[PDB]
Amino acid sequence: VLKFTTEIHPSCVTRQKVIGAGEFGEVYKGMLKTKEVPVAIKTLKAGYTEKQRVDFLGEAGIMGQFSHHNIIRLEGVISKYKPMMIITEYMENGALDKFLREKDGEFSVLQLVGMLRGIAAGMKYLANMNYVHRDLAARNILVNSNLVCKVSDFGLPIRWTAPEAISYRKFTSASDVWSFGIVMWEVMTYGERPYWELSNHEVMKAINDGFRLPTPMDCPSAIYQLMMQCWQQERARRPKFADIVSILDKLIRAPDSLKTLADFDPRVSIRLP
Numbered sequence: 285v286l287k288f289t290t291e292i293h294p295s296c297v298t299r300q301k302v303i304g305a306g307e308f309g310e311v312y313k314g315m316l317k318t319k320e321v322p323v324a325i326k327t328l329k330a331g332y333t334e335k336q337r338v339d340f341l342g343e344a345g346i347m348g349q350f351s352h353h354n355i356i357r358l359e360g361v362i363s364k365y366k367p368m369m370i371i372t373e374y375m376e377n378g379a380l381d382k383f384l385r386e387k388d389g390e391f392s393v394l395q396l397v398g399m400l401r402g403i404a405a406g407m408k409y410l411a412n413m414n415y416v417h418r419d420l421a422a423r424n425i426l427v428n429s430n431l432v433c434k435v436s437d438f439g440l441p442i443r444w445t446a447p448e449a450i451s452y453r454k455f456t457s458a459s460d461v462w463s464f465g466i467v468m469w470e471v472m473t474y475g476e477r478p479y480w481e482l483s484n485h486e487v488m489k490a491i492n493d494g495f496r497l498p499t500p501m502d503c504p505s506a507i508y509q510l511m512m513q514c515w516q517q518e519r520a521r522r523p524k525f526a527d528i529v530s531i532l533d534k535l536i537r538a539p540d541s542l543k544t545l546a547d548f549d550p551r552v553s554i555r556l557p
């Protein structure tokens with residue numbers, strides 16, 4: 285299980301502040317020696333069950349297998365001592381959802397599209413590795429100080445989930461593509477809530493009736509077209525992540541393609557002379 289993971293000795297780890305919770309233990313911000321490097325640390329505390337131990341070390345195992353620029357990096361694991369720990373890199377900019385809501389309007393279209401290309405490349409890698417994420421959303425993406433997005437999974441999302449996954453529990457890389465389209469909309473809106481104040485039942489009814497999120501403000505036509513393709517009801521009609529990466533790469537490498545904007549439908553019109 286731990287074959288792509290490095291065992292870290294507990295004397296090299298300092299926990300500082302609680303930043304969240306695991307299934308059976310806290311997540312902390314801390315420091316790792318090997319000068320000191322900031323890390324996030326998920327613990328498994330005394331009394332955990334067999335199933336919790338299997339899921340915890342299984343999680344570390346899969347994270348260790350991933351080696352990609354756009355996937356969170358595992359620094360290592362403590363499995364030989366208690367409490368057990370999963371240790372990852374740390375990003376001062378934090379999670380993408382809060383980041384964009386706190387930086388409204390501060391980036392260029394090219395910067396936003398570049399973020400999406402990195403997320404798509406991480407997802408293409410996961411899908412190729414036969415890993416279905418199931419919870420792709422901006423809240424599960426970390427942003428580094430180069431604006432590079434790292435797909436993560438912080439644990440627990442009707443508004444991000446494809447219809448077949450909601451209806452009959454069919455989670456695949458194609459349901460992850462639906463979620464990616466929602467993430468595109470989150471990025472281009474600077475972290476707006478998908479479907480605004482609609483309830484979960486209202487969202488599913490709207491989707492089943494064929495309604496889809498409208499274009500963000502200032503959004504390239506090509507980007508809105510791409511998110512719309514991610515939201516095809518028929519799973520097989522959605523692009524694969526390889527198609528998404530290819531499209532986004534081509535738009536970035538010919539950036540004039542992003543200057544054509546989709547028409548924004550105003551809710552409110554102001555009359556002025």
Ligand SMILES: Cc1ccc(C(=O)Nc2cccc(C(F)(F)F)c2)cc1Nc1nc(N2CCOCC2)nc(-n2ccnc2)n1
Pocket residue numbers: 303304305306311324325326343346347350355356370371372373374375376378379410417426435436437438
């Ligand atoms: C410690 C830790 C453990 C596991 C994971 C994680 O991603 N596992 C995972 C599992 C399956 C698939 C994938 C996937 F996607 F790669 F495929 C990834 C991330 C963190 N690391 C971490 N956890 C948080 N949390 C936020 C608060 O709630 C608790 C968690 N915050 C930060 N953090 C904040 C600022 N800089 C870093 N790091």
